[PDB]
Design a protein around this ligand. Structure first.
Ligand SMILES: O=S(=O)(O)CCN1CCCN(CCS(=O)(=O)O)CC1
Ligand SMILES: O=S(=O)(O)CCN1CCCN(CCS(=O)(=O)O)CC1
Ligand SMILES: Cc1ncc(COP(=O)(O)O)c(CN)c1O
Ligand SMILES: Cc1ncc(COP(=O)(O)O)c(CN)c1O
Ligand SMILES: [Cl-]
Ligand SMILES: [Cl-]
Ligand SMILES: [Mg+2]
Ligand SMILES: [Mg+2]
Lengths: 373, 373
């Protein structure tokens, strides 16, 4: 069976976890610290904090900006539910904006238009666009728009560690940026994430919030404010540190497999049967998602791929369709693209241990399903 | 150097983590499921959920009971800050009650008296007593009091997995009970925790909240409500599963070391120089904390123990002294015991790899410091 994801943990990391478990510095230590330094260096960004998961990064980003009851944040319609959920868990309201059919990312024009017509009652405080599947496209526009309207930008870069927006690493443009190390992502620590920022107060506040408001004072550990526990373990950090220096190379290989998909599938796209993703420069290809034409039933397609030894899945959800984010501004809007991607979007296997023969088999099987051969 | 804590990870668990990392079922799986079943069986309780840490268990317990803005929860003055912090992170207010000089646990009489004189404005919804250091004493009284006043009981059993209140396992008396698997605790998963309950709706709600409101529906995974990510990894769960069948035995050995401390130190207690903890039946001895007399400076004692090759620390904090929990009801109360334990309480090494000679060395060194020999 060709699998969607096969997490790759280097043997050196496995040995290192063993050493840690046996010695027994388990809690956040020199491994987390070093992982943060290496993440910061990788990204070109002043600060990193590793945390329990990608949702925690988002959560701390909201909390550090003091976003909560009375406030509003704009989220894309197409994403994993965490993006909108985590906004509402603070008390704020998730205001949904549709995404663009080509990028699968928040539509910058709908975004600006949503801001201009905003009528409260809550105060709009941030934009939380998703760089979906590792796609950076739109990011500079989101920044430009956020500044024009005096809003914070929080990058939900869950899927985009290693993606690059022209000259600038994804995650480093927002006031803060957030990454997931969930096993479906390309660097995984099983569960894990990171919150990054160029802002010292946001960093220091998130860091207090991450660990019970603890910081170092003259006579020892001080408790300066209320907080949570969103710490990552030292052995998880070690896992991540071993993957990070391989990550760019892994991404390069993924872009090469995407080239293979694109050329093999281009005729099906020509015939109007599928829409292929635009893998722009700096796309990290965390996911390769096509869109099935209208005529097809994704459930049947997936079944027939599975019978041919190929895994597939939906790409992401439609937040409007979940019916959980019920600000009047959402119920009075109309969403077109996100709901379509939710039903017709089909992720195909693309990871570190697929080769050209695997992709040829996948595309031939797709062909035979769609064209009936 | 004799150490306060030396986390014990069995070699079988280490190998199992390796297998998991290499195979790569990383996210919550059959290991978490099984760990929950074994925890439930160990405790005699209907439901367990493993979670990222002990603070997360507490958090989910609050959220599952719908505790937040407008609400109040009673917490002990002597505990780790998470207990009070996590109440306030929901929007509720932490109402502090002093603890008892012998048990280090919430004073049941001050508790009841705090309820009787409560004057809002918030609605009092719960009691969150701490079974501090693994001490069960008071637990049935907390239940009795909670029922009399129609309040939920949430056990902060962070430190008390394996402790027993007469016939009944700690954690199984509250509407919910919460455990930490932090490395200072006797079973550790590096970071980890569990939320347990005999109530099906609280279990089902916490479980939705733990993972983005996900549950199983006829055509697949459904998103039924907003939630968080508080999942534990499959490999962490494996660690915990390997420790749990050893835990009772580990506790028995700890009670035996406590016997040794008690007899070696009893003269110092006789002379009024220290107060020894009362290790009642069912105390899991997560921590052995003495209280220094007035005359002594704990900082100097700790320094001199360290120079004699012995680690020590404070036991816990005073919530009133942190000045973070500022409901009028707290600022107009007076706390006696918690503030004293905060300054005079001294934890001494007691874990799986200390022997009688280690304890004899510790108590002789203490003796020579206090009596100046
Ligand atoms: O697609 S296959 O599974 O048939 C072969 C994939 N190869 C296996 C060898 C590791 N890696 C080299 C990169 S690194 O050493 O991990 O940085 C390239 C990916
Ligand atoms: O105190 S010492 O470090 O000198 C010796 C401690 N022993 C080491 C042997 C493991 N265990 C047996 C219990 S179990 O097999 O882990 O369940 C008892 C604790
Ligand atoms: C866009 C997006 N945002 C947020 C998250 C949440 O990250 P985590 O799973 O690490 O909690 C995910 C997880 N797949 C995601 O894809
Ligand atoms: C009484 C108490 N409550 C809550 C916690 C929080 O648990 P965790 O460290 O697993 O987040 C601790 C941690 N030592 C604790 O001792
Ligand atoms: Cl190849
Ligand atoms: Cl011995
Ligand atoms: Mg060991
Ligand atoms: Mg492997």
């Amino acid at each position: 069976m060709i699998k969607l994801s096969q997490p790759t943990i280097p043997e050196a990391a496995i040995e290192r976890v063993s050493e840690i478990l046996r010695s027994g510095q388990l809690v956040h230590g020199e491994e987390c610290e070093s992982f943060e330094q290496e993440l910061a260096s990788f990204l070109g960004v002043k600060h990193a904090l590793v945390v329990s998961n990608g949702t925690a990064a988002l959560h701390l980003a909201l909390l550090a900006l003091d976003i909560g009851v009375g406030d509003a944040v704009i989220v894309p319609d197409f994403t994993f539910a965490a993006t909108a959920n985590i906004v509402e868990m603070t008390g704020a309201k998730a205001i949904i904006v549709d995404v663009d059919i080509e990028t699968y990312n928040m539509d910058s024009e709908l975004l600006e238009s949503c801001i201009q017509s905003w009528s409260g009652p809550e105060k709009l405080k941030a934009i939380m666009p998703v760089l979906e599947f590792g796609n950076p496209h739109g990011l500079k526009k989101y920044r430009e728009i956020a500044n024009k309207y005096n809003l914070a930008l929080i990058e939900d870069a869950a899927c985009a560690l290693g993606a690059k927006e022209q000259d600038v690493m994804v995650g480093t443009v927002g006031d803060m940026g957030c990454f997931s190390f969930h096993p479906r992502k390309t660097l995984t620590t099983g569960e894990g994430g990171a919150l990054v920022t160029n802002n010292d107060q946001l960093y220091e506040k998130a860091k207090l919030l991450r660990s019970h408001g603890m910081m170092r004072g003259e006579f020892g550990i001080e408790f300066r404010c209320i907080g949570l526990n969103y710490r990552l373990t030292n052995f998880q950090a070690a896992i991540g540190r071993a993957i990070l220096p391989k990550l760019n190379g892994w991404i390069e290989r993924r872009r090469e497999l995407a080239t293979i998909y694109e050329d093999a599938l281009a005729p099906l796209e020509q015939q109007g049967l599928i829409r292929l993703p635009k893998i722009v420069e700096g796309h990290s290809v965390q996911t390769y998602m096509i869109v099935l034409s209208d005529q097809f039933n994704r459930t049947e397609v997936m079944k027939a791929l599975k019978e041919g030894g190929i895994e597939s899945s939906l790409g992401a959800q439609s937040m409007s369709e979940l019916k959980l984010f019920n600000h009047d501004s959402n119920t009075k809007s109309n969403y077109i693209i996100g709901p379509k991607l939710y039903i017709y979007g089909l992720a195909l296997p693309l990871h570190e241990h697929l080769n050209i023969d695997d992709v040829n088999k996948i595309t031939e099987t797709l062909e035979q399903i769609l064209l009936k051969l």
